[PDB]
Amino acid sequence: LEFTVSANTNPATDAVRESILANPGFGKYYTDHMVSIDYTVDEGWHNAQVIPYGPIQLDPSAIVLHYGQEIFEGLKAYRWADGSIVSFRPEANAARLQSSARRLAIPELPEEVFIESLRQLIAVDEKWVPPAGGEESLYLRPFVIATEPGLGVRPSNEYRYLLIASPAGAYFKGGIKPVSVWLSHEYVRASPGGTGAAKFGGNYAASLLAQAQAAEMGCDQVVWLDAIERRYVEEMGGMNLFFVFGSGGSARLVTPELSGSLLPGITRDSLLQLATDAGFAVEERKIDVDEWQKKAGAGEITEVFACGTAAVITPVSHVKHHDGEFTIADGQPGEITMALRDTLTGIQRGTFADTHGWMARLN
Amino acid sequence: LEFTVSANTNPATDAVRESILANPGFGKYYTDHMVSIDYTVDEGWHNAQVIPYGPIQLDPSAIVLHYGQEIFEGLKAYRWADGSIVSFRPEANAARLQSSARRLAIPELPEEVFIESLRQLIAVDEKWVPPAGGEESLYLRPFVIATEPGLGVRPSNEYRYLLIASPAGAYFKGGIKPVSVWLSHEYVRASPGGTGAAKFGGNYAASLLAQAQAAEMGCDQVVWLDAIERRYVEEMGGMNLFFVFGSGGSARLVTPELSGSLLPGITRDSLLQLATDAGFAVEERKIDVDEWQKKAGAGEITEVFACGTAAVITPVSHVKHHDGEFTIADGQPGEITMALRDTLTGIQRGTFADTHGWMARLN
Prior knowledge:
Protein name (chains A, B): Branched-chain-amino-acid aminotransferase
Number of helices of chain A: 8
InterPro entries (chains A, B): Aminotrans_IV, Aminotrans_IV_CS, Aminotransferase-like, B_amino_transII, BCAT-like_C, BCAT-like_N, BCAT_family
Radius of gyration of chain A: 21 Å
Keywords (chains A, B): Amino-acid biosynthesis, Aminotransferase, Branched-chain amino acid biosynthesis, Isopeptide bond, Pyridoxal phosphate, Transferase, Ubl conjugation
Largest sheet of chain A: 9 strands, mixed
Shape of chain A: globular
Family (chains A, B): Belongs to the class-IV pyridoxal-phosphate-dependent aminotransferase family.
CATH superfamily of the largest domain in chain A: Aminotransferase class 4, branched-chain amino acid transferase, N-terminal domain
Largest interface: A-B, 63 and 63 residues
Oligomer: homodimer
Binding site for pyridoxal 5'-phosphate (chains A, B): 96, 204, 266-267, 309
Structural class of chain A: alpha+beta
CATH class of the largest domain in chain A: Alpha Beta
Number of domains of chain A: 2
Number of strands of chain A: 19
């Protein structure tokens, strides 16, 4: 599968680009080009190309516009001191896009094609990757949408894979500042036999009211409890959660297990490995509101943090729910939270040794 | 709101339009024009217009293409013998679109604008409405999508309301035909507090795998059981369900109650009323697989049918699930089922008295 290149004749001026990179925000600006791959039952994935970033055309009756058959991924590209451009565990996103595709009846995109699309876009828009050593990065958003016409409800037979990139700074408006959370009493993220394990747009549209309610209760973010017993803590928005018991080299790390409806975070997977590398004991189990509030107040649970690609790690300092409210430790970012954040971002930036071979070159 | 008209300079030739109407199928072909209304915060709904049916444009980062914030509706336009074009309970669709919008954090569209969009489209594509005297019609698909660019997860501030029409022939070409159902053991349609009560794309994409499995088990359609106890019957695909007990004028109808997570079918609402008009007793309550199989076998439940806008009423003659398999009566369309379908389609076609004022003129 080969990509053809159609250069953007009217890209952003170097001044504009530089301006963006010095103050990108998140998912606000986009690079000059994008990747496009079409899919039909008879030709499979074809017509792969790098074209100028621009409006996309869809028939008014396109499936994605009526029955929400779409999926997406999210990863980053970093610039290193040696001039190379790399990504953090690209293969993991490639494999997850496939699992998401299967759950949504979307044809899988070969992993080598996935990786290739990344190299192709970086080849033409490398100048959009922020300078080395900094905290900035180039967010990559690969996604697939159903584009076949027809108002009948069924899997689409035509799809379009798109890859766009957006300069990225801090995801949350508070940066590293800790966030307060509202445990949703009225809504659930997903339930068994659903789409909670897939990165599917439908999951997000359904969470909008629950997040507005969190803010109306005086909190920054909503946290989800299992849809069955409405007791076990699972995720903050679309981020995984970790609980630190104790501190120092003897501290214990607890995080909800992959129920089957829980999003299998790449960052989550990485942090469990990093914690073990540091000698910390890790534990994947269920944990409810009572244990959380009780042990937090007791002082056993010394920290809590959320993790995901965009924000990496976000400290959680305050909790509010239908039957209570409490603070985690002194309300400040915890030692372990910041050590692990520092360790992971260091590996991604090329500062620390990548013993697991997580960093892949894209150049 | 005033609508501007930009006539299609390249409409379908009479030869093509006529060949379409002779064999339209469903959701396969579209009329010459479509309605479009834009939304922005500072101007609310504006720029209402009737334009040529054609491809839509969206930024690659448009929210609808990433976080599935979209909703839709389905209704019809019929041609009566007196030459007028009418619609069945359009106000109900207008009110449900607003209800679906609230659940998905989308600005509500005034009922007056919704109805006017319908009149406007018919004013120009009236020639696409099938002739009177038959069961054919013009299917109307009003829908709203989030068009604002930006990869941050949150409710969009820009939307586009579209209205398209597709010729619909007689649903049951060679006589009505009953379907076999597979009760999904592995999948769930929606969860409590979820988006199960709104016509929202996400619900449909998440159901594709379950429908494929139903077919793989040798059945026509998948039927959903509640997400909590996995035992109470909810719907068949995107259609509601009814259970007929007994026969003749003393027959009784039972249908799952609106648990708040069930789709408030308009056809469903109408049938309960018509059942009352005919003298049938009606019930809105829970009914599980055990009761269904036990009473269907004992000959107490004599019929089962599904209902929705497209097909109106579809008979269900065979059931298969994880713990059993059984047939309903003689496996043929039931008396009450056909009587109620004849009555409703009769009102919609203008053959029977519309004592409830359900039919609205669009002309």
